[PDB]
């Protein structure tokens, strides 16, 4: 009968913003006022309309009028610095635009959706406005800035400009029902694509008495006392008010997917016109019945199941019976006499907000549905004698009461009718639960570690690290917020928080250009760091910056000489993504070589030297390769992405996968074949052909001059501008070591039996090529710095370069690591991230960057020896977040109880604070 | 690749309205100007802005400005009487509202859609406006009427009020692209229901120099010469203009169904925003590319197939290259160098119509697509050096040229970008052909009649009757139009028309309250009647009225003594609906009685007396019953519907079917059983029990007094207040006849052997009830006047009353016909229609109405003896149409060649004429 003909989604409400009379600047303040039954109407403020006053003719005309209604306490104030507006430009901006910008920020903050995440997305803005009162002040004399400021279109276009929205931006105007129409258009769009989020609302402002005087001149429109008595026997008119409201709308599927909290649901909506009635301003009950029937047909809901109606309620003796009649025809048809539809109007509390009444009505029902109470309708001194509520199945709810729930759930209807004939109706329902729902030995070692870990935790439980994020568009604002946050934490309410809800709430705040992070284990540490951050004092547990870096980060995959007894074990047990990718690499290696690396990672006795019989030279490379892959994918899971990559003779396989040149399986084959061939080849020869490598403090130019006397020696790695790794027979290296010491130059030996990038690899090339057959190189899709191609930058989308000959050249010929780093600095890169169990290549990178004139480079280190594997990746993510790099800070605080125990999470931290300064346009008249 | 993801309809354009500069008030004038390459820009008129002038400060500032652009010749004029507005109210109405009302009327007239047919329908109005300039004049001092007049919402709400539209009525505002956005919303609605027709357009007006001066103060925006040079090397700005346009949109399926002529098709549309660009007023090519891609994805069209682009073309040296760049990315991608996309802009001809540019662009392409020519773009003195058209696959078409049709059809794109960032694009294509596509002896007699008819036509072809409809909201306007129409007919163009296209065109004009019809066989008769109608002179071939009657018509089904040799034969051959329903009744009668009535209707020898052996008393009733059903359904086919029904002892069966109490088959059973039983019963007895009926001029009260002496006599029919039909033995009737003559009272005998409503029926009731078993009476659903229940009015929705006992009572007991007529007059009914082969009951009805005080009753007669069966039903329809009764006058002119030979139909009759009088708001400043 009333089922949906079209297969469409239900729209979910996730945020609300209020700027209504009575200092109701937040939904919480609004909800308390509604329960208390507060009359927000008041006399005209002394400081309003002063521009038109001082003229006796207009002044006495104004006094004779009513001039009583809802007025904003502060309308001239505006934080131009926050919104990047000059004083001259800001003074010529209509307050309607100011409210829209402020309301949009509060709504996203109320919805816990970082406004930075919506930049460049398909977000629509539909805002209702009817009167350009501010334009009259400009023309009293003027500046061209008034054209954009006072324009109605700029009310929404400016919002989509400041927040960088790439969706529809239109300003509707249907007089007294514009807000509902704007909501209707947003709902229809989301059902038809064209957007993923929608900001819908309305705004109004009483800047001049022209409109108020005109209505008074008509007579019989404005109430003498300024109080509305919707559906009462003393109805005598209404009063005009100013304010605004906004809502954030998303498809219910998206809200469930993204973890957003759903306050209510918009099942359907409809709009029509009264047609030829008894005058342009006369309502037509027949049209009102049609739109109600039209709306509930779209919503797929039988009107007999409705529990509450937020009526237009203009307090007109003649227009109220008409509205009741239409409701009885549709809503009050067939109902039992003991199941009436509750009736009420918010205009009794706030007044008649012309283009913002719909927003106020929608906000009221949204809070009522989110909670489980129905607020009363004030100014009710008896039923209207011309309306038979019993015969129409209606009841005016004038007391705090709970939802009857006739159908088992809560359903409400919001109706708004314009004075030109335009009508609208929106159907709302509560959120339901249904809306929230769509290797043997390795196991033995794994179980032992978990039991040992759990047992150790009992003796001494570790305190989890929580990164607290503070950000703003300016450093001064950032540190002011930190001090306010610290004071709140020290308060009893803050002390009664888990310190994880605080971080979760902050992670969903706007992430500005000036960012800071505090690494705290308990409240006291967080307070100390925030207080230090309140000023410019440094602190070990505080990361701060003043602005983002120009270019993206660079990932370094060296993985040489960075192995120890227990690497990748603590993070494997206490993380899932890291463990997942480790297993995938383990399976691939098991297929190729026939043994599992988990038996080595999990085992504690193994130290990768004399404890593993199967060629420690081989297992070490595989374990490091697996760790590098796991760390990179873990960073990807949190949103991090590399702008460029670079490797040093062992991470080229891993670097290729991250860039995209080769698949994971193909990369695993290269390292496995390389590692196994090196291990067996080294064991094949002993004494006769053995050649070892050493580190010498020499430059590339110096090496050419000094290699003339030593013919056989070869250059292996250009680690630094003044350092180089070479290989050759021990006698030649020994002479070099003695020669360097004679000149005062530092040197080493690396104590490594293996030797790569030398003649030893030559026999291995023939069989290495055969094993590498079948690999399919692909386009990079990411910046690359080939250390085998003389450190030449390669742009994304270039032709594949990971053919077999590429690996043979790298294994045999030297690697130009220092050259690649210098080229990256030339391109502008300044942040370098190393993925390895122990950072050893950062020192080499630091020397190269300093030699190139870069001394403030960001050297970020992943897992390090003798430090907790967790609390080190978290710090790495924080540094990327601080310096403006790509990172979804919301991933560090996953939700455990979605729709179950949301109370204990999402703490009540202080909100963003604005500094409002007067901005108004002088006028004399 | 570019196919539609969603299954949606294509929108069709059926009407266009123009109010552009250069006196382009009709599409035909606009099309000629575009071909000729007309520059509609001109200097400021001397009579404009005089209110602000006379002040030296503002005057010299205005002179220093450009003040050159498109201005309307007459903007103050307005026909307030036509739109029912007072002088005080009209003077405070923005010209934007005036244009919308006028444009909507012209568009419906151009689309040949009677505006009266859309009253109460789901029609949406989406209109774009940006500047409320008129509101500044009111506030210079004022009246409250300025609130509604100058409001932006009332621009569309007033339109939906005057024309009685029950759909969405919203006023969009996206600055310079509002018209396209309004079109977009209408298209989306129609695809999603919410409406069946949509009026989309925009309007702008230059009432004050405030905006023009402001733009001049900025500098670099307005051209010194006021001429636009879109895509040229001399671009130096643009000029502001005023005007408006409208379009009528319907789903292509509905347009094909309703016979509407399709000018073009809107495949798809899209809108977005530029986001954070280099300033609020700086365009962003990236967003422009997205909306183009977005639009063509919705339209299901590959951009490489486009043939022409109606670009924004603001003549800006910096904004034109940006628009070209985006087009090359999407439209000009992959094209051959010899298949460029033609480029042009209408702003070069008219100027920059801020909120009406989209309407002008859409109208231009609509006429180009409806025709087969591309108009040029004027002011092109060479390509812009900063745009590489060859590399972007673009061509500026500056000459009259035909569509290249790369894909085999015509495709065009209209783009409009606002100065706040809002952007829109609409895809249009021509209309294709695929869019216009989804009883033996009776036969012998039928063939003879057709051959005889065709042979007779050759000797003397008959001239068809054509009803010409003239109507208006006032009698004075109606007769003024008739004189203008007559002059046009007498002109050579009128003489070159079929006189059927003229009627077809008039049938699709608005049908006002004051209506008139001219029944003409040739042009000369039409001229004479129209000239007579120009004044108050009466004319036999002219039907006229000053206003509709209060209540609906009443259908009278008597069908007694209204038979002749050839009835229902001429109309059977020359009409299809009449023949169709005759056959259906024939089949039902054949099933029941076993013989066909067509053998009687088609035969000419039969006269229903001594020529038919099978009980002439029986066949006569069946033939009349069949004719009554056919006439009623024929009237229903043309839109006529009865408010109430009434019958006289023979049409009760037919009356029941029309009301809805019984089905057609059940009604046929009642008459068949009644007729057959009467025929056999009368033949059963002869001489002994024979009783005949006679007509006597007596009243009901008199009959009671006079029936005391005559016990056996009974009253059969109360034909009139002073007349009555009685039945009884011949001796008793003979005494009554002599007695009446002795008193001077007229009487008759009816010379009828049969006698109903007497004792003869008593034996027939027993078997009559058995034959009537199985009939299922239903609720009436229509007004009824039961002549068997003492003429008591029965309301629709009442319980069934057509049980078996109802028919037994009617057959046996008298019928109160005069009582039913009087009751109908009491309820307010004044129009009575008789369905019978010959009107005999109208005389009786006329006497009753006069006795009740009604002397101007509308007595409409269907088929009459010795008159053409056609030209008599047409007159009956005309009388119903004249007096405001329900009738679809468009059905009388069916289309023969739909999409084939539309040229010869839909003649070019004069359009509706308005009397414009100055209405302006004085101001001093």
From TrEMBL, chains A, B:
UniProt keyword terms in alphabetical order: Acyltransferase, Fatty acid metabolism, Lipid metabolism, Multifunctional enzyme, Phosphopantetheine, Phosphoprotein, Transferase
Signal peptide: none
Binding site for (R)-4'-phosphopantetheine: 370
GO biological process: DIM/DIP cell wall layer assembly; fatty acid biosynthetic process
Superkingdom, taxonomy of origin: Bacteria
Presence of the UniProt keyword Transmembrane in the record: no
GO molecular function: erythronolide synthase activity; fatty acid synthase activity; phosphopantetheine binding
Protein name: Polyketide synthase PKS13
Species classification: Bacteria, Bacillati, Actinomycetota, Actinomycetes, Mycobacteriales
Annotated gene: pks13
Residues of the full protein shown: 114 to 1099 of 1841
């Amino acid at each position: 009968d009333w089922s949906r003909t079209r297969d469409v989604e239900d729209i979910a409400i996730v945020g609300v913003a209020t700027r209504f009379p009575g200092d109701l600047n937040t939904p919480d303040e609004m909800w308390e006022a509604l329960l208390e039954g507060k009359d927000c109407v008041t006399d005209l403020p002394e400081d309003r309309w002063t521009e038109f006053l001082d003229e006796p003719r207009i002044a006495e005309r104004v006094k004779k009028a009513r001039t009583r209604g809802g007025y904003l306490t502060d309308i001239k104030g505006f934080d131009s610095e926050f919104f990047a507006l000059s004083k001259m430009e800001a003074d010529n901006i209509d307050p309607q635009q100011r409210m829209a910008l402020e309301l949009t920020w509060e709504a996203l903050e109320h919805a816990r959706i970082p406004a930075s995440s919506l930049r460049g997305e398909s977000v629509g803005v539909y805002i209702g406005s009817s009167t350009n009162d501010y334009s009259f002040l400009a023309m009293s004399d003027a500046h061209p800035y008034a054209i954009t400021g006072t324009a109605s279109s700029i009310i929404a276009n400016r919002v989509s400009y400041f927040y960088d929205f790439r969706g529809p931006s239109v300003a509707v105007d249907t007089a007294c029902s514009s807000s509902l129409v704007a909501t209707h258009q947003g709902v229809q769009a989301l059902r038809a694509g064209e957007a993923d989020v929608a900001i819908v609302g309305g705004v109004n402002a009483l800047v001049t008495p022209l409109v108020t005087v005109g209505f008074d001149e008509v007579g019989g429109v404005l109430a003498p006392d300024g109080r509305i008595k919707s559906f009462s026997s003393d109805a005598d008119g209404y009063a005009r008010s100013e304010g605004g409201g906004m809502l954030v709308l998303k498809r219910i599927s998206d809200a469930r997917r993204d973890g957003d909290q759903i306050l209510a649901v918009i099942a359907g909506s409809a709009v029509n016109h009264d047609g030829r009635s008894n005058g342009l301003l006369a309502p037509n009950p027949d049209a009102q019945a049609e739109v109600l029937r039209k709306a509930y047909k779209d919503a797929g809901i039988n009107p007999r199941d409705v529990d509450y109606i937020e009526a237009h309620g203009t307090g007109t003796i003649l227009g109220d019976p008409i509205e009741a009649d239409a409701l009885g025809r549709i809503v009050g048809k067939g109902r039992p006499a003991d199941k009436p539809a509750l009736l009420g109007a918010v205009k009794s509390n706030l007044g008649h907000l012309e283009s913002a009444a719909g927003a106020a009505s929608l906000a009221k029902m949204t809070l009522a549905l989110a909670n489980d109470k129905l607020p009363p309708s004030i100014n009710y001194a008896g039923p209207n004698p011309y309306i038979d509520f019993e015969k129409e199945r209606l009841k005016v709810n004038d007391t705090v009461s709970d939802w009857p729930r006739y159908s088992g759930k809560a359903i409400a209807g919001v109706s708004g009718f314009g004075f030109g004939g335009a009508n609208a109706h929106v159907v709302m329902r509560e959120v339901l639960a249904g809306d929230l729902v769509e290797t043997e030995a390795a196991q033995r070692l794994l179980e032992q570690a978990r039991e040992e870990l759990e047992a150790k935790e009992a003796e001494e439980p570790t305190k989890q690290l929580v990164p607290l994020a503070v950000s703003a568009f300016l450093t001064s604002r950032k540190r002011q917020a930190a001090a306010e946050l610290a004071d709140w934490i020290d308060s009893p309410e803050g002390r009664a928080s888990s310190l994880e809800s605080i971080g979760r709430s902050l992670s969903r705040r706007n992430h500005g250009r000036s960012r800071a992070v505090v690494l705290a284990h308990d409240h006291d540490e967080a307070i100390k760091g925030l207080r230090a951050l309140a000023e410019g004092k440094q602190h070990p547990s505080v990361l701060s910056a003043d602005g983002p870096v120009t270019n993206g980060p660079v990932w370094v995959l060296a993985g040489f000489g960075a192995q120890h007894r227990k690497m990748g074990k603590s993070l494997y047990l206490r993380n899932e993504v890291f463990a997942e990718w480790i297993n995938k690499v383990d399976a691939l290696i098991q297929d190729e070589r026939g043994y599992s690396i988990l038996e080595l990672i999990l085992d504690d006795n193994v130290d990768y030297t004399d404890a593993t019989c199967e060629y420690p030279i081989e297992v070490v490379q595989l374990v490091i390769f697996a760790i590098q892959i796991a760390l990179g994918e873990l960073l990807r899971h949190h949103g991090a992405k590399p702008a460029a990559v670079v490797g040093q003779s062992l991470g080229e396989a891993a670097a290729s996968y991250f860039a995209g040149g080769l698949s994971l399986a193909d990369a695993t084959r290269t390292i496995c074949s390389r590692s196994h061939l090196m291990g067996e080849g080294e064991a094949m020869l002993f004494g006769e052909y053995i050649r070892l490598m050493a580190l010498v403090e020499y430059s590339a130019d110096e090496i050419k001059t000094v290699f003339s006397d030593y013919p056989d020696l070869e250059v292996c790695v250009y680690a630094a501008p003044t350092q180089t790794v070479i290989g050759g027979p021990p006698d030649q290296v020994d002479a070099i070591i003695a020669r360097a010491e004679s000149e005062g130059k530092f040197a080493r030996k690396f104590q490594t039996k293996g030797a790569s990038h030398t003649q030893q690899m030559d026999p291995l090339l023939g069989e290495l090529a055969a094993e590498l057959q079948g690999i399919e190189p692909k386009p990079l899709t990411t910046g690359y710095f080939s250390t085998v191609h003389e450190g030449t930058f390669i742009r994304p989308g270039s032709a594949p370069i990971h053919d077999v000959d590429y690996w043979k050249k790298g294994l045999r010929h030297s690697v130009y690591f220092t050259q690649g780093i210098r080229n990256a600095v030339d391109n502008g890169h300044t942040t370098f991230l190393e993925l390895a169990p122990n950072p050893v290549a950062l020192m080499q990178v630091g020397l190269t960057t300093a030699s190139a004139g870069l001394h403030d480079a960001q050297l970020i280190a992943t897992l390090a020896r003798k430090q907790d594997e967790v609390e080190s990746m978290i710090s790495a993510m924080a540094q990327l977040y601080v310096h403006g790099h790509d990172l979804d800070f919301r991933t560090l605080f996953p939700r455990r109880s979605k729709g179950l125990a949301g109370a204990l999470d999402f703490a009540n931290i202080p909100p963003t604070r604005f500094k409002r300064k007067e901005h108004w346009l002088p006028a004399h008249f």
